[PDB]
């Protein structure tokens, strides 16, 4: 079928940094590229599954590993990994993103015939939503669509003034980690700088409601809804 897709582990070095992650590839529908950034657990099966889902919709999807091969299954370990990434290793993570983009472009991954140019998006969840905003602002000439899910705005400074891509920002109405007052502040910054950002806030659900492997927070109805919206948005801006 036209939806056929496979996946493979990448591991290589470029411009002095080690890149690894999971690349899901459509067999027939060789479309735009989406970079997918994991939660604070690391690059676990759920995130690779999300990549596969993108590939079935006609996107190359790269689940980049920002934790150098480490994963966590408990909050104490996960918290340590995330703090190290966002504190000590942020410049390294930036370099990994940049080297990844260069790699894909050199391999013509993400080249779209209709526009005769590259079309690369980025999405992520939790910590990965923070990263989507942050890297979206840092590499504002590289991305054509951003879809951060329930990122925190208070961890690293997001340069809203630099964002050039359209943004679909997904938030949970009862998010324990991201108060609605923080979302409001992000909206006001987007208003101030003319960022083309749409904020989608689902009432009644918690942080990580998209994660189907976490029955304590997963919400099927909204997960299905938001997937529909996200795919449509990525198609609109990347094809």
């Amino acid at each position: 079928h036209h939806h056929h897709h496979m996946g493979r582990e990448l591991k290589f070095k470029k411009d002095g940094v080690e890149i690894s992650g999971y690349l899901a590839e459509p067999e027939f529908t060789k479309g735009p590229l989406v970079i997918v950034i994991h939660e604070w657990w690391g690059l676990v099966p759920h995130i690779k599954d999300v990549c596969d889902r993108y590939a079935r919709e006609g996107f190359f999807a790269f689940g980049i590993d920002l934790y150098k091969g480490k994963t966590a299954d408990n909050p104490d370990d996960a918290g340590r990994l995330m703090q190290e990434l966002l504190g000590q290793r942020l410049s390294e993570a930036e370099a990994m993103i940049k080297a990844s983009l260069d790699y894909f472009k050199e391999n013509d991954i993400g080249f779209v015939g209709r526009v005769q140019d590259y079309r690369i998006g980025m999405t992520g969840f939790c910590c990965g939503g923070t990263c989507t905003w942050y890297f979206g602002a840092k590499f504002s000439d590289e991305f054509s669509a951003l879809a951060p899910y329930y990122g925190l705005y208070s961890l690293v400074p997001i340069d809203f003034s630099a964002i050039k891509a359209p943004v679909l920002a997904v938030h949970a109405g009862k998010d324990a980690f991201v108060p609605l007052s923080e979302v409001l502040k992000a909206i006001e910054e987007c208003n101030k700088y003319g960022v083309k950002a749409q904020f989608l806030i689902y009432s009644g659900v918690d942080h990580a409601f998209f994660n189907d492997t976490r029955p304590e927070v997963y919400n099927e109805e909204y997960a299905v809804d938001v997937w529909g919206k996200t795919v449509e948005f990525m198609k609109r801006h990347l094809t």
Copy 2:
């Protein structure tokens, strides 16, 4: 499209009915802005009909329209302030009329599927009537309604809601949208809030170049049609 005019249960009903290709299908009630039932709203009804919905642009102003804000404000204040019981009766009589004519009846589910959407004043009305007639609606899509005009009983709402807001809305501060989200959280309302940065009130209205935003109008239309299809077909 047909201009309806009739009486039921002591109230005069009028509005514009746009009809899809088939004789049967879901119904969307479309509520006008404070200008009244003007060509733009009838066009929106036509757009719904092209997507397979019966769409009824109900006139809540008894045939009056306004082309300037002073007149429009007077009409809206009279409707919401003095004639709200009458408007409720018109909504109820409209629903009864369509049901008796098997409009809104969806074969797949062997039941009525009626949605409601509206803009500005009509968004306020969508929330209000959605709460008042909570056994009647299967989907609500209020666009940039005010929450401070009429009492919205969030606890009564039973339909899913797609609430559209403008990030730089001069009439609806973001603090009011926040409060509505918190009420939906509190009472278990299945509401999704969509807030578009950088745009003003009425950004969907393609006849108003000072506020129309094509990119977001196209986006929100796509999302609204998908939402109505999900809940009404």
